[PDB]
């Protein structure tokens, strides 16, 4: 058009329509006087060869041809139809799955309780009980409250108002209401009081956590009884009371000063349990008024990160299928040495930022609070005392009469009751008050909630007079096991940055502060009954990015139903036993097509059917996976590979797993899998890297690798050393110079020209430095401190008289000088030793098969050298690790090439050539 080019909507850029001398001038003055923003530059979209003009759907929905179901799986068959002059990117495809989910009775997406949270945890509800008479003869005792002040009390109840001349009485079904009482702080004469009380027939439960559903629209909870005529009727019964002194009188003066509305209710404790059960005897009693409640542990339950586990991968028995209708041959070739899920995890990390959540794919990385993993104990800022005061601001007082002086005398005084009251309330001295250390309490609560309750089960004990399951994998067991707060109190490693030794080997991601798991639990909702509707992506490396040319194709895949696989819980309890169930109602397949111009689509199809233009992909992980059993408490882990070809071997990577948290894939269903926590093998939530000591690599036999006198200790890879006489540790921890150098080179190629912090983009979530956490602390020297004394938790007393004894129960004992912990600071500091260690979560240990350990090219220089390229070699690796009281696994990834070439010669045909070297099929 004419005016567009003039107004620079269209036309040429500023560099082209301006004076050449001015453009030259602008380039010269750019650095100190830019003129770019002064002149418009047009941007024009192409008008032809891009988009079609005929009617064309952007999204196709395919309902499955055939669906089969077992108890633990279900396979769906789709006929993916790519029409002519249409082009489909498999990245734009996903399965739309809908069903009903039941997370079960162990799902608790919150801490604390929903009911009477502010109530003191030992305070009972207004209750009654039968008790031995003793002056069988029994009598009923009442313990209650009467907050409502009424007009009068007759046999018709408490008078709550008047309707002209008629007195109005409380509707027993909901009046008086328990949340109503006096509106002023100071005392008043209440000659006609009323309240509600629970009958002796209703079990005794502490107020904290008490819930009784309502039986009427006005909030009444009185259980209704079905009468003969078939109508429901209230069983609320009135109980009148007067003072014992008043009942001593003859009787004519006898009148009730209190009326309690006694009722039965369906009490329950949905989200709390009993922390102190005084007696095993069942039935209401005065003793049972002392039982204390405690909120049930939080247990978030959701679908896994990136919907890990929903789709079968790397399972020969349940292999996905993509094929052309014509050719019966399948394009998918899956192996059990492949790890598709973990590959997708690390791939996603390499591409983008895993800290960001994307609801569609359940893309929310598993994580843990850093201040929970490593405790950084600064103590508390409690310099100022904190006080609570009387609601009146004064407290108890005495009554005083005013007096006035005899103004003509030295010290004469006279009563003055004419103008002033003789009962004036005055308190002499400071007001009444109580004291609390708020920050100390908050710190203590944090430690007990996030750390103490997660200690290994060997440090807990079974509650007294409370039934508990026999299965340690159940929520009931994890919830009722008692941990004493003194194990993780305010004074733990005070002033150190130090993770508890007992917690190092505990999966930090099985925690209620796992932000990712929590987000994925709340994406479903806050209830256990959840109708869900989700989108599941294709992760197999050969397909997920394939560009499918016209033709029809069978796309068939298998899916899991195992709650322990498809669901994830923060506590890891066995969701099979704990009542979780899932049902997949329907499934569809959605494919998004570029509305490509038909001439362009045909030309591109033609170009892509040629041999030279076969599409090629490879697994990001690019490794063959091997798991070697490490029996309990074993430190030496020997493994050997028979003589074979190593051409293109890229290197080793390894970490350590727990057999409990690692399911046996390929079987289709693991009957011995009793765990619903994170699965590091799949999601990359590794956390046992610190338990490695050293690795010995021996090619063939007697040939050490890398040898050549390279390392400070050349025969073996020394990861960490306990007290190095040589002084080969680094970075103020127990890691070796050799190992640190190797890892820095493997991850960033830094070692040889100085050590520094890698660039952020190079140091990602699963990188080494990002997760490298060295730590040190001091501890009493039991040999050199002459006054040492071993005082277990049973006889430690710090904050005695203000905390519970060995339980999260109530205040107990007396004030007394502490006997624990030993002071490591100040004039009286004890002789101390120093312990160094480190943590390295999420990352993998890397030994690249490179001459200088660097990354100069995927195909390592050693992967090409003559020795390993034109000969066969057997391998013998020996890992020395820290002992652990349960079976573990050595996870070794043999870094190789895992490539696939994909050829589409004709419409509806698809051929694939798979190669993985070293370690071929």
């Amino acid at each position: 058009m004419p005016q567009w080019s003039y107004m620079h909507i269209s036309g040429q850029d500023a560099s082209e329509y301006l004076s050449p001398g001015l453009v030259q001038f602008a380039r010269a003055t750019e650095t100190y006087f830019s003129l770019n923003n002064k002149f418009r530059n047009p941007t024009v979209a192409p008008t032809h060869d891009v988009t079609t003009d005929r009617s064309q759907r952007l999204t196709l929905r395919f309902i499955p041809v055939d669906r089969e179901d077992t108890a633990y799986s279900y396979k769906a068959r789709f006929t993916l139809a790519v029409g002519d002059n249409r082009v489909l990117d498999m990245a734009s495809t996903y399965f739309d799955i809908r069903g009903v989910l039941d997370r079960g009775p162990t799902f608790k997406p919150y801490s604390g309780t929903a009911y009477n949270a502010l109530a003191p945890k030992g305070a009972p509800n207004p209750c009654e009980w039968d008790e031995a008479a003793t002056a069988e003869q029994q009598k009923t005792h009442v313990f209650g409250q009467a907050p409502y002040s009424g007009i009068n009390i007759t046999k018709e109840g408490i008078q709550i108002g008047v309707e002209g001349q008629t007195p109005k009485y409380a509707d027993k079904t909901f009046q008086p209401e328990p949340q109503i009482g006096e509106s002023q702080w100071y005392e008043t004469e209440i000659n006609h009081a009323a309240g509600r009380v629970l009958k002796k027939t209703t079990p005794m439960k502490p107020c904290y956590g008490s819930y009784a559903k309502p039986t009427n629209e006005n909030g009444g909870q009185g259980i209704l009884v079905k009468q003969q005529n078939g109508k429901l009727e209230s069983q609320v019964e009135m109980q009148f009371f007067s003072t014992t002194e008043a009942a001593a009188g003859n009787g004519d003066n006898l009148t009730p000063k209190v009326v309690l509305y006694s009722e039965d209710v369906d009490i329950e404790t949905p989200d709390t349990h009993i922390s102190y059960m005084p007696t095993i005897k069942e039935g209401n009693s005065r003793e049972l008024m002392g039982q204390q409640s405690m909120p049930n542990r939080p247990n978030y339950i959701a679908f896994r990160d990136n919907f890990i586990g929903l789709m079968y991968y790397n399972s020969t028995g349940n292999m996905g299928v993509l094929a052309g209708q014509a050719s019966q041959l399948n394009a998918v070739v899956d192996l059990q040495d492949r790890n598709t899920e973990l590959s997708y995890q690390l791939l996603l990390d390499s591409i983008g930022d895993r800290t960001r959540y994307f609801s569609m794919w359940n893309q929310a990385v598993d994580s843990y609070d850093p201040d929970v993993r490593i405790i950084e104990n600064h103590g508390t800022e409690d310099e100022l005392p904190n006080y609570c005061f009387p609601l009146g601001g004064v407290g108890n007082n005495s009554t005083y009469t005013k007096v006035k002086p005899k103004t003509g005398q030295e010290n004469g005084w006279e009563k003055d009751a004419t103008e002033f009251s003789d009962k004036n309330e005055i308190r002499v001295g400071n007001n009444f008050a109580m004291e609390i250390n708020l920050n100390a309490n908050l710190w203590r609560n944090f430690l007990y909630s996030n750390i103490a309750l997660y200690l290994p089960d060997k440090l807990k004990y079974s509650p007294s007079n409370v039934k508990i399951s026999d299965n340690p994998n159940t929520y009931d067991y994890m919830n009722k096991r008692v941990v004493a707060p003194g194990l993780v109190d305010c004074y733990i490693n005070l002033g150190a940055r130090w993770s508890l030794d007992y917690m190092d080997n505990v999966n930090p991601f099985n925690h209620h502060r796992n932000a990712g798991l929590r987000y994925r639990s709340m994406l479903l909702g806050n209830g256990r009954y959840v109708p869900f509707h989700i989108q599941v992506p294709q992760k197999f490396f050969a397909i997920k990015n394939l560009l499918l040319l016209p033709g029809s194709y069978t796309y068939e895949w298998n899916f899991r139903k195992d709650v322990n696989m498809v669901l994830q819980s923060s506590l890891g309890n066995d969701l099979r036993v704990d009542g979780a169930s899932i049902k997949f109602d329907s499934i569809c397949l959605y494919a998004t097509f570029f509305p490509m111009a038909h001439n362009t689509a045909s030309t591109l199809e033609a170009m892509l059917r040629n041999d030279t233009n076969d599409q090629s992909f490879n697994d990001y992980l690019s490794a063959a996976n091997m798991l070697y059993p490490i029996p309990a408490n074993a430190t030496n882990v020997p493994i050997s590979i028979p003589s074979r070809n190593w051409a293109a071997f890229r290197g080793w990577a390894f970490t350590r797993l727990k057999t409990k948290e690692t399911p046996s894939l390929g079987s289709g269903y693991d009957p011995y899998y009793t765990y619903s926590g994170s699965i590091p093998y799949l999601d990359g939530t590794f956390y046992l890297n610190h338990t490695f000591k050293k690795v010995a690599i021996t090619f063939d036999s007697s040939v050490s690798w890398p040898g050549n006198d390279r390392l400070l200790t050349p025969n073996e890879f020394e990861i960490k050393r306990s007290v190095d006489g040589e002084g080969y540790n680094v970075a103020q921890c127990n890691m070796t110079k050799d190992w640190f150098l190797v890892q820095m080179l493997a991850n960033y190629n830094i070692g040889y020209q100085g050590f520094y912090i890698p660039e952020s983009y190079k140091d990602r979530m699963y990188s080494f430095f990002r997760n490298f956490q060295p730590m040190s602390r001091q501890v009493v020297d039991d040999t050199k401190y002459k006054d040492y004394q071993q005082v277990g938790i049973l006889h430690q007393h710090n904050n005695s008289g203000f905390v519970g004894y060995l339980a999260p129960t109530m205040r107990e004992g007396q004030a007394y000088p502490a006997n624990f912990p030993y002071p490591l600071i100040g004039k009286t500091a004890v002789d101390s030793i120093t312990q160094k260690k480190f943590l390295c979560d999420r990352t993998l240990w890397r030994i690249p098969f490179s001459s200088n350990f660097m990354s100069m090219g995927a195909l390592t220089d050693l992967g090409q050298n003559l020795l390993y390229a034109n000969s066969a070699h057997a391998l013998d690796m020996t890992f020395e690790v820290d002992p652990m009281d349960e079976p573990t696994l050595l996870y070794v990834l043999f870094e190789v090439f895992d490539v696939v070439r994909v050829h589409r010669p004709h419409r509806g045909v698809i051929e694939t050539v798979y190669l993985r070297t070293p370690f071929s099929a």
Partner: single-chain antibody
Amino acid sequence: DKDIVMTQSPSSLSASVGDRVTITCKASQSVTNDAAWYQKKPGKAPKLLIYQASTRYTGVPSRFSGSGYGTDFTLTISSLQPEDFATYFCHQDYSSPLTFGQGTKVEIKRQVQLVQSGAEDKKPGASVKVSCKVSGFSLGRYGVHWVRQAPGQGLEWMGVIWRGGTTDYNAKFQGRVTITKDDSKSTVYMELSSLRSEDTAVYYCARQGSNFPLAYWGQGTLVTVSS
């Protein structure tokens, strides 16, 4: 907050040794039981006889007795004796200003120490400053009052300086009186201004007890004023 007038009846009396004498006092308002009777002879200073209506001060013969409460009080001598011929005064310290009665005249029919400065005299319109040296007690424990007796008149309470230094003056003097004290020198000063010929009087330094009225007096200082 309004002067309490002690009305003493009769005015004068004639008596013989052995007779019984009775004097009465009517206050403008109740003083509970804060009535006291004093005996004064021309030369000497007042002597406390009865206080709190019915209580006999220390070293007072048995023949003296007091009675009454509120507004009415009575002082009776059961049997007169030549040493008792003097002029007796009603008194109240329930309220400030302290007030005495007009004083009755008994005529015939046929340790703690306060020392004042010397007497003096001056012309109208001028001022005086009188001293009162104290011994036997601390001025931080007691306040010192100033009273005066004008010829042919009763007893006039002038003011007081209390233990804490707080002064209280008789409004009748229109702020002419100013009382000060030096604790170091243990002396009390009373300064009167704008003298008039009617201020010709004896001026007495005085001190009360912890729980009984004025009981310790100075020697008296005669101030004369004439044109």
